[PDB]
Structures are given as structure tokens and as C-alpha cells.
């Protein structure tokens, strides 16, 4: 299954909803107490996701026994006020007595929105920030962008993403409130990959520390390999454990710990979201690399020069009749990169029944050092 479903994510600052207003797109109108229901109606959006901060517990006198029971109380009460039965993402946020780190909101939305994209078979995403307050809008937008980027690359599909906002404040039903398309982008597997790597490669040298042993070095290295089309490396240098550990890290509930005067909320720093997106995209490349798979990777996941270099190397390999035993490419015909990841002294080739494979074999440590 593949899927062409649409979804709208909406940042809602007040789970009680808002004064009824008449929203409008292209002259067509829909009256609502929340912009997201108007976007859903006017754009015929399949799925709805309301994003709330844990801080709105205060509105309903929800208890702080633990994050899960607190968020369940929020959802039960908001469903009745908003007339939206599902789905809800209730994220760690900083607001009044609720204390923490704003980037934790980002991490949480990235991870939870990614899971939703997987489940829903999505090809079009709307992000409605009409009712967001403080930093909700900027961080939900960027966290969802990251999730759609990871999703498009791993699922190998195109996903359209649009940012919407309106201004219903101090208006009523006699007011017409336009829902504006602010920006619309198309994310392809290539541009999803490039966004994910971009978010690793523009961070300071210590940014990815304490994620796993030597993560401070391993993470930017894996990102550089992904960014430059080193598919054989992504296939052969196992990162499945890193991915599993990050899933474990992000799957656990935030901690809610009440003070005298405060509720402290602890989730995971942004570096965990960026790292997960990286290893999630890398998981696309698992398994042995035969020539047609590599041709496809070149077309799908490499920029134009890198694609051309890889395809030229493959063209050269396809001129020869290939045997069962493994030989270095040299035996048939900056160096790592000038040959698009197939340097002749550092890559083997072999034929196993109907496929020719390229592998670094026991030379992978040499390759790793040149990344």
C-alpha cells in the first residue's frame, strides 16, 4: 500500500476553542469555532490532528500523576469543547507555571507526527498555525517539515506541504476571515533527504554528543555519507542499533514533576529528533547493493553530479561479464568521492545468480576514514 491521503496539523492554544467566525477560501465559506474545521471542510482534508501543550491541563484541573494520565484528561475534555474526536498530539511545552525547554516541543511533534504520517498513507500535509501562541507555530512547522522530509525519503514518495494561517481574533460570524495559504512546497525523496542532512550538518561539533558512544563523530559522518550518495556505506555500516535506541529514547513519555510553584516537564533535546530523522532515512538503504538498486538510488537520492558519476561507474561495470568470486573494481578498469563512492582499489564486485553486487567488504574502515 502507498496512499494519497491528506492531513491537517493544527496548533491550538486554547482547548476551549474560539468565538465562531466565518472562514473563507476562494469565496467559499464555513462557520467554525476553530480554524482547523474550516480548513478541513474547505480543502476536503481527510485527517485532522490537534496539537495542544501539556500546559492546558490547568484549564480542566487535570492531575499531574504522570504525563499519560494528564494528557488523557486533556483529550477527554478538549474533544468535547472542540468537537474534534481525534487525533490529538499533546506536547511538552513551556507556559506560565509549566517549565522546561522549548525545543522539547519540537522533538515531540517531530516524532509523533512522523508516526501519524506512516499510519495514514499521506501525500498532502496542511499546517494551520492560526491558533498557535508563543513558539508553537514556528516549532510545529519546522518539526512537521522534518517529519515529512524523513517520511518522503524513507517511504520513497512525494509529499506536498502547505502552511496556512488566518486572523479570527475579536471577530464574529458577521466577519469573513480569510484562510491564507502562506507557503506551499513539494518534498521529494531527494529533497526530504537533503533537508534531513542539512539539519545535521549545520550544527556545532559538540551538538550530537551523548546520544551514543562517539555519536559526536559518528552522526555527522553518517550525515555526510547520506548527503553525498555513499549508498554502499549506508548499507554496510550497520546503523540499525542507533535507530532502535533513538526510537526507545523518543517513545518514552515525557516526565512531569510538580514543584511547590511549578510543573517541570522533561522530554528529549532537539538533537534526538535530528538524529532519529537521519537514521530513519538511512534505514532506506539496508541490504546488499546490486547494480540496478544502485542505479535507482542514484536517480532517486543523489544530486545531479553525484548521480552522473555513479551511473558512469555502473555503465563501465556493465560492459564486463561478471563471475562468482569477488575482485576489486581495479581488476576491470578525494578518490572515494571522485568515483562517486566506488573507488577502484576499495570496492569489490561479484555476480550472484542474476545480480552484480558492489561491496566494500573488509575495506570499509578505509572508506570510513575518507568520508
Residue 90 is a binding residue for Mg ion (CB under 5 A): yes
- Residue (109 or 234) nearer to Mg ion, CB: 109
State the Cα–Cα distance between residues 217 and 211, nearest whole angstrom. Answer: 11
- Residue (51 or 177) nearer to Mg ion, CB: 51
Residue 69 is a binding residue for a copy of itself (CB under 8 A): no
Residue 308 is a binding residue for a copy of itself (CB under 8 A): no
Peptide bond into 87 cis (omega under 30): yes
The one among 238, 262, 299, 366 contacting a copy of itself by CB under 8 A: 299
Which of a copy of itself, Mg ion, none binds 90 (CB below 5-8 Å, type-dependent)?
Answer: Mg ion
Which of a copy of itself, Mg ion, none binds 31 (CB below 5-8 Å, type-dependent)?
Answer: none
Residue 74 is a binding residue for Mg ion (CB under 5 A): no
Give Rg (Cα) of the chain: 24
We find the least distance from the C-beta atom of residue 5 to a copy of itself, in angstroms, to be 6
> Which residue in 128, 65, 150, 139 sits closest to 101, CA to CA?
139
Interaction pattern, residues 179-218, with a copy of itself; x per rule: CB under 8 A: ----------x-----------------------------
What is the rounded (10 degree) CA torsion for 253, 259, 261, 266? -30
State the Cα–Cα distance between residues 57 and 65, nearest whole angstrom. Answer: 12
Q: Which stretch binds a copy of itself (CB under 8 A): 79-87, 107-115, 205-213, 323-331?
A: 79-87
Cite the DSSP H helix spans in the chain.
35-42, 67-82, 103-120, 136-155, 189-201, 215-227, 231-236, 240-251, 270-282, 291-301, 304-317, 335-338, 364-370
> Which residue in 151, 313, 152, 148 sits closest to 229, CA to CA?
313
Residue 356 is a binding residue for Mg ion (CB under 5 A): no
- Residue (26 or 365) nearer to a copy of itself, CB: 26
> Which residue in 347, 340, 349, 352 sits closest to 364, CA to CA?
347
Size of the site for a copy of itself (CB under 8 A): 28
Q: Which residues bind a copy of itself (CB under 8 A)?
A: 1-6, 41, 44, 46-47, 79, 85-86, 121, 155-158, 189, 292, 295-296, 299-300, 311, 315, 354-355
Amino acid at each position: 500500500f502507498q496512499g494519497m491521503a491528506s492531513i491537517v496539523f493544527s496548533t491550538i492554544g486554547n482547548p476551549k476553542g474560539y468565538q465562531k467566525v466565518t472562514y473563507e477560501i476562494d469565496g467559499e465559506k464555513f462557520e467554525s469555532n476553530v480554524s482547523v474545521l474550516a480548513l478541513r471542510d474547505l480543502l476536503k482534508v481527510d485527517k485532522t490532528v490537534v496539537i495542544l501543550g501539556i500546559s492546558v491541563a490547568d484549564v480542566y484541573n487535570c492531575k499531574y500523576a504522570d504525563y499519560r494520565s494528564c494528557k488523557e484528561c486533556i483529550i477527554q475534555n478538549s474533544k468535547n469543547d472542540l468537537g474534534i474526536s481525534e487525533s490529538y498530539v499533546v506536547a511538552p511545552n513551556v507556559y506560565q507555571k509549566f517549565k522546561g525547554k522549548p525545543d522539547h516541543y519540537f522533538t515531540y511533534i517531530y516524532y509523533h507526527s512522523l508516526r501519524i504520517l506512516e499510519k495514514e498513507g499521506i501525500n498532502e500535509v496542511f499546517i494551520d498555525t492560526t491558533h498557535g501562541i508563543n513558539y508553537m507555530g514556528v516549532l510545529a512547522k519546522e518539526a512537521i517539515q522534518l517529519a515529512v522530509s524523513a517520511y518522503a525519503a524513507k517511504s520513497e514518495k512525494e509529499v506536498k506541504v502547505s502552511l496556512y494561517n488566518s486572523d479570527p481574533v475579536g471577530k464574529d460570524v458577521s466577519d469573513t476571515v480569510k484562510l491564507h495559504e502562506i507557503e506551499a512546497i513539494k518534498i521529494s525523496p531527494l529533497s526530504g533527504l537533503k533537508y534531513v542532512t542539512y539539519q545535521i550538518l549545520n550544527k556545532d561539533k559538540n551538538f550530537f554528543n551523548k546520544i551514543f558512544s562517539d555519536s559526536v563523530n559518528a552522526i555527522p559522518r553518517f550525515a555526510t555519507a547520506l548527503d553525498n550518495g555513499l549508498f554502499i556505506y549506508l548499507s554496510e555500516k550497520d546503523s540499525s542499533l542507533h535507530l532502535k535506541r533513538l526510537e526507545d529514547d523518543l517513545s518514552k513519555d515525557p516526565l512531569l514533576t510538580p514543584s511547590e510553584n511549578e510543573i517541570n516537564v522533561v522530554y528529549k533535546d532537539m538533537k534526538y529528533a535530528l538524529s532519529h530523522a537521519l537514521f530513519y532515512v538511512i534505514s532506506r538503504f539496508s541490504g546488499n547493493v546490486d547494480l540496478d538498486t544502485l542505479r535507482h538510488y542514484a536517480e532517486t537520492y543523489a544530486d545531479k553530479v553525484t548521480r552522473a558519476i555513479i551511473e558512469n561507474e555502473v555503465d563501465k561495470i556493465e560492459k564486463y561479464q561478471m563471475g562468482s568470486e569477488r575482485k576489486l573494481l581495479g581488476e576491470y578498469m578525494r578518490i572515494l568521492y571522485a568515483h562517486g563512492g566506488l573507488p577502484y582499489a576499495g570496492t569489490y564486485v561479484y555476480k550472484e545468480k542474476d545480480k552484480v553486487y558492489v561491496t566494500y567488504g573488509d575495506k570499509i574502515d578505509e572508506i570510513e576514514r575518507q568520508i
